[PDB]
Every structure is written in C-alpha cells, then in structure tokens.
Scaffold this active site. Structure first.
Site, mmCIF file in Angstrom:
data_model
loop_
_atom_site.group_PDB
_atom_site.id
_atom_site.type_symbol
_atom_site.label_atom_id
_atom_site.label_comp_id
_atom_site.label_asym_id
_atom_site.label_seq_id
_atom_site.Cartn_x
_atom_site.Cartn_y
_atom_site.Cartn_z
ATOM 1 N N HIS A 41 -10.799 -16.474 68.314
ATOM 2 C CA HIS A 41 -10.233 -15.303 67.658
ATOM 3 C C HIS A 41 -9.728 -15.618 66.250
ATOM 4 C CE1 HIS A 41 -6.031 -16.509 68.349
ATOM 5 N NE2 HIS A 41 -6.230 -16.583 69.653
ATOM 6 N N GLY A 143 1.027 -18.285 65.167
ATOM 7 C CA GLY A 143 0.465 -19.421 64.461
ATOM 8 C C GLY A 143 0.241 -20.664 65.313
ATOM 9 N N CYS A 145 -1.580 -20.841 68.021
ATOM 10 C CA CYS A 145 -2.887 -20.837 68.668
ATOM 11 C C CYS A 145 -3.709 -22.047 68.254
ATOM 12 C CB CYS A 145 -3.630 -19.538 68.348
ATOM 13 S SG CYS A 145 -2.773 -18.130 69.068
HETATM 14 O O1 LIG Z 1 -1.020 -13.634 71.745
HETATM 15 C C1 LIG Z 1 -1.527 -13.626 70.677
HETATM 16 C C2 LIG Z 1 -1.276 -14.776 69.674
HETATM 17 N N1 LIG Z 1 -0.180 -15.583 70.187
HETATM 18 N N2 LIG Z 1 -0.290 -16.663 70.963
HETATM 19 N N3 LIG Z 1 0.958 -17.104 71.232
HETATM 20 C C3 LIG Z 1 1.873 -16.276 70.605
HETATM 21 C C4 LIG Z 1 3.294 -16.257 70.531
HETATM 22 C C5 LIG Z 1 3.941 -15.252 69.791
HETATM 23 C C6 LIG Z 1 3.191 -14.266 69.119
HETATM 24 C C7 LIG Z 1 1.789 -14.281 69.190
HETATM 25 C C8 LIG Z 1 1.142 -15.302 69.934
HETATM 26 N N4 LIG Z 1 -2.389 -12.484 70.301
HETATM 27 C C9 LIG Z 1 -2.650 -11.410 71.253
HETATM 28 C C10 LIG Z 1 -3.973 -11.811 71.924
HETATM 29 C C11 LIG Z 1 -4.859 -10.911 72.779
HETATM 30 C C12 LIG Z 1 -6.002 -11.653 73.221
HETATM 31 S S1 LIG Z 1 -5.950 -13.181 72.671
HETATM 32 C C13 LIG Z 1 -4.564 -13.122 71.832
HETATM 33 C C14 LIG Z 1 -3.048 -12.432 68.980
HETATM 34 C C15 LIG Z 1 -2.601 -11.514 68.037
HETATM 35 C C16 LIG Z 1 -3.229 -11.452 66.797
HETATM 36 C C17 LIG Z 1 -4.291 -12.309 66.503
HETATM 37 C C18 LIG Z 1 -4.974 -12.212 65.127
HETATM 38 C C19 LIG Z 1 -6.168 -12.821 64.763
HETATM 39 N N5 LIG Z 1 -6.413 -12.468 63.495
HETATM 40 N N6 LIG Z 1 -5.393 -11.647 63.086
HETATM 41 C C20 LIG Z 1 -4.523 -11.482 64.055
HETATM 42 C C21 LIG Z 1 -4.744 -13.224 67.444
HETATM 43 C C22 LIG Z 1 -4.119 -13.283 68.693
#
Ligand SMILES: O=C(Cn1nnc2ccccc21)N(Cc1ccsc1)c1ccc(-c2cn[nH]c2)cc1
Ligand SMILES: O=C(Cn1nnc2ccccc21)N(Cc1ccsc1)c1ccc(-c2cn[nH]c2)cc1
Lengths: 302, 302
Positions: A41, A143, A145
């Site tokens: 992603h 951030g 991820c």
């Molecule tokens: O959950 C996430 C990313 N993530 N991981 N651990 C987190 C702890 C605190 C906040 C966000 C956090 N998501 C939601 C999603 C749903 C399916 S996979 C991931 C996420 C949100 C935004 C992005 C993004 C990529 N490009 N722009 C934004 C990616 C993951």
C-alpha cells in the site's frame, strides 16, 4: 535471576531498514541481498485505500518512481514486482549488512521481536505474541508500516512479520514476508472482524514455571487435575484447550522444577477459579500468556 | 497507537560488547575508542569475593593477563587501571564501531535499556527503571556482569549502568561507567540492605496519561485534589511525594490530553484508595511506574 519481557538484540535488523517513497507516501522497507521488501500500500494515496485496485495502481509505477534510501545512501531500483500484499524492489546493490536470514510463517501463540521504525530509522524494540486470532498488540504510529518482526537463532534472523495496518479496535495486523496476511485481514480501509481471541494456555503454564524458577511459589498447591478436567475449566475461562503436544513441550520445564505439568495445571485451575487474591506473580496481577516455553528456557539458560 | 515497554534499538551497543577474561573468570566489557570497561571483580577468584583487596589483587596482574576478545578479533592490551569499581583496559585499536557516546549518572526514577550479554555476546534487550532505592529489577544470570544500560538521544548513546551483582533478594545492583555504585552497595559478597523502596509517582501519572491517549479512560472521574491532599495519600501508599517540578514535567501530557495534572492526581488517589475493581489499564492490573513522562511522549510521538 529475574524474568522480563525480553526482545532479541536488534542490530542485525537495524542494518536492513530503509525508507521507501512512492509519490506521496513514505514507509519502511527491508533490504536483504539485492531486494527491498515493503507493504504494497505504499503505492496508494489516502483515497485509494478504501477500494484499492493494486494491480492497476502498480501498472502506473516504474522503477524510477520508487525512491529507496538506506540512511543517506541512495539505492538504484532495477526491478519491481508484487507478491501477495508485499512489493519486492530489485536494487543494484546487495545490502553489505545482510545477516544470515530465513522467511518464516509463525504459528499463533508464538512470539517475536518487533523493531518499530519510522522513515527507515529504528525507534524501539519489544516482544509481541501472535494472538490466537492472528492480531498482535503492538505500539505502531502512523509511518510505522513495513516495520518487521523476527526471531534470532544463533546467527540467523528468521523474519516472520511485516506491519501493515491498525484495526479500528486498536490492534495490529500484518503479513509474513511473502506478503500473506496473518488472519482474515485485507489491506483495505474497511471495518474487519478480528475473531474471538483466547488466552494461550501453554504460555501461561510456561510462565508459571518461570515464576517458580525465580522464587514465586505461593500459587503451588495440594491439588492435581486431569487433562480433561482442566480443559473444562479452560473452556469456561476462554483458554486454549490443552493437548498432549502442549504437555510434551512443557517437559523440560517440568523436569527442571520437578513439578508435574498436571500439578501445574491444578495451580492454574485454582488461579482461574479464585483469582490471585491481591497477590502478584513475577510482578503481574494478571496471568501472563506472552512467553512461550522456549522463551522461558532461553531466558533461564542464557 | 498501543503502548508497550519499549527498549532502544541495541545495534550501536552490540558493536561495543567484548568478552574479558582474567585467569579464571570471564565477563563482558564495553569497548569504546581504545578503552575497554568492565567490572573490576573480573580479577577475583570465587573465594576472593568475600573480602577482596582489589588493589593487591590488581597488582598481581599484567597487561598480558587480560584477554579481550571482540567476537573473534583479539585485542592487544597495552595498559590497565582501576577507577572506583571498574577496570579500564587500554587496547591498541580503537573500536571501529564506536558510536557517538557519553557517560551519564542517571537519577532514580529514570529508565534505560539493558543489553543483557554472556561471553561478550548479546542475548536480549529490555527496559529498566532505576528504583528510588538504586536497585534495578532486571534479568541477569551468571556471566551477565558487565552488561550495560543506556539511553539513545538521536545518534548519541548515553551509557548509564554497568551490571555488577545480584543481591540475595534477587534484585540487581551496578555502577555508572565511572565505576561508582548506584546506592550503598559494594562489590563484596556480603548481605547488603537495599533501603525502603517507593513507587515512582510521576511515572504512574505519566502512564495514566499514556492510557488516556490510547483509549483507556474509565479511571477518569468527577473529582479533583490538591498537591498537599494527594501527598497525604501518597505517604499512606508508599508513593514518592509529588512536587511542582513533577507537575511541570507532566505539562506536555497535560496539554496533549487536556486533563489537568491535579485532576489526574485525583484519579490516582481513587485508584490507590479503592483499587482497580478487577479492571485493567493498558493491559495491567497494577499501577505501572516504569515509564517516565519522556518515555510516554517519545512512544506517542514516534
Ligand atoms: O492502518 C493503517 C496504517 N497504520 N498502520 N499502523 C498504524 C497506526 C496508527 C495509524 C495508522 C496506522 N491504514 C489503514 C489500512 C487499511 C488497510 S491496510 C491499512 C492506512 C492508512 C493510510 C494509508 C495510506 C497510504 N497512502 N496514503 C495513505 C495506508 C494505510
Ligand atoms: O552477584 C554476583 C554475580 N552476579 N551478577 N548477577 C548475577 C545473577 C545470578 C548469579 C550471579 C550474578 N556475585 C556476588 C557479588 C558480591 C559483590 S559483587 C558481586 C559474584 C559472584 C562471584 C563472582 C566471581 C568472580 N570471580 N569468580 C567468581 C563475581 C560476582
């Protein structure tokens, strides 16, 4: 003596962390030999993540759209491909700091160390267990991820986890290093059911043995039980059923303390039916299920 | 989100760990620039440790009696000296992996990461607090002496602790890197009084703020208190008296959550006087005092 939640030394993994940027988004990647691994992603915009078509999104990207930085050194991307939910970026330099490593898919109830990272830079390290329902209870901010979980066997790093998402319940979900999610989760921003969790019985027992080794013995009692009787209690208190495979894994701890596994199950039964009565065990007022039998023997052998 | 006991990434310290052997005994040393630091009781035999005369014992030793190994590479010792309870072995090669570092003496109530080591090889990493009574509750087996505690600020490793001994009570005692013990302990095998300990009040409050940031809010209540009223309660429950210096340190967490410090003291008061009533806070059924306000802000900022 003493017993603490202990992570593996993180040095061999620190030398592998890079930052990966694709247009807008930056996250962490894992640089091993001449390949960098990161969550797919990274190719999404915020809006993309509700119903992302990863195939089409990736078609819009060329080798030069993936900027990979290992600290200050810039990596030249010469290939890209998607495997399940991970991207594999071929770079033209093998990581000189690549440790001996394997990719493993761990079982629920097993533990590993997480090196939490932001912008490719290590932040901290801690132990996690893969829950029976294939979530982990970590500490991940935006951030983080692409941060990875691992075990170390002698000189070999077995990577088992890459971080992908936080569920609205606040628990964490990710993949193995072949990009296959643990559990039923997908990399889309939808609400997703994490199934019923349960307590990892064999780990609670291993931890009770750890407690006896380190002086906490007040929970030892006059009683014994049977596998079937205990499993009635486990069912009532939402503990994993105990099997003979579990009994066998607990053999060395049984042998080192001289307390038969079923006698320790009798202690656990009493704790479950009556609580701790305000006492503590290894500094905790709850029953701890995040140490495997191997974790106990490793920390109690050096 | 999420909140876990998180250690610093240990890589910069792993590259400094060596094994030090002097006749019989082997323990860990810390190789920084062209000096190796280790506990002076490496020069003792088992019998020596009841009433060791370290000056005389060291006079019997020459540069060539100290064997120093950094993994496989052998270090050539060209000087030796004793500073308080540490030995400083001058070697002829500067450690190429020396990080930017300082030596610091930490205050009670501050936390640090411990890289537990055996035979110069890293075993695991975990967080510790210096107790109010200058002990730490670690996990150290025989051979772990010379393992060090540290904090990392950006790129700089501040070494604060070197491990020397386990007390018969099972808690641990050590020195700063100038060889000065924390607390009243000495490097002799006698029974030694660790004074009355107390709970680190400002850390429990910082942890309650961490809990609110991460969704646990049930302990928040309708009440407030005063510094003096709360300090009456702290006295009864063997908590450190709270000072205005503590209130100020908690300012940023007060600001980020909008909960006045004294209102949070009112929550802590209720928890101390009534317990948790079987609930949990950040996964614990006890009040946690091993996170500093800085630890909370660091883990909640990235
Ligand atoms: O959950 C996430 C990313 N993530 N991981 N651990 C987190 C702890 C605190 C906040 C966000 C956090 N998501 C939601 C999603 C749903 C399916 S996979 C991931 C996420 C949100 C935004 C992005 C993004 C990529 N490009 N722009 C934004 C990616 C993951
Ligand atoms: O406490 C120790 C060494 N130590 N540290 N952490 C431990 C965890 C488990 C077992 C032993 C442990 N002592 C006692 C002593 C009293 C004053 S300083 C240290 C200790 C015992 C033996 C030696 C020794 C040196 N040469 N031969 C034996 C050193 C320290």
């Amino acid at each position: 003596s003493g017993f603490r939640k202990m992570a593996f030394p993180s040095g061999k993994v620190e030398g592998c962390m890079v930052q990966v940027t694709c247009g807008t988004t930056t996250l962490n990647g894992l640089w091993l030999d001449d390949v960098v691994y990161c969550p797919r992603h990274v190719i999404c915009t915020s809006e993309d993540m509700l119903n992302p078509n990863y195939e089409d999104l990736l078609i819009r990207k060329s080798n030069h759209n993936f900027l990979v930085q290992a600290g200050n050194v810039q990596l030249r991307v010469i290939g890209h491909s998607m495997q399940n939910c991970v991207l594999k970026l071929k770079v033209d330099t093998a990581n000189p700091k690549t440790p001996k490593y394997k990719f493993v898919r761990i079982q629920p109830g097993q533990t590993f160390s997480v090196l939490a990272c932001y912008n490719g830079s290590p932040s901290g390290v801690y132990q996690c267990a893969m829950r029976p329902n294939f979530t982990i209870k970590g500490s991940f901010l935006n951030g983080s991820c692409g941060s990875v979980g691992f075990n170390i066997d002698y000189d070999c790093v077995s990577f088992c986890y890459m971080h992908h998402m936080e569920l609205p319940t606040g628990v964490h979900a990710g993949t193995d290093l072949e990009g296959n999610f643990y559990g039923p989760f997908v990399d889309r921003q939808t609400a997703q059911a994490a199934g019923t969790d349960t307590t990892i019985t064999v780990n609670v027992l291993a931890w009770l043995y750890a407690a006896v080794i380190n002086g906490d013995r007040w929970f030892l009692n006059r009683f014994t039980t049977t596998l079937n009787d205990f499993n009635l209690v486990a069912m009532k208190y939402n503990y994993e059923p105990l099997t003979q495979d579990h009994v066998d894994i607990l053999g060395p701890l049984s042998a080192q303390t001289g307390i038969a596994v079923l006698d320790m199950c009798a202690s656990l039964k009493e704790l479950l039916q009556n609580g701790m009565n305000g006492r503590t065990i290894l500094g905790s007022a709850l029953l701890e299920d995040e140490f495997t039998p191997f974790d106990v023997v490793r920390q109690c052998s050096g």
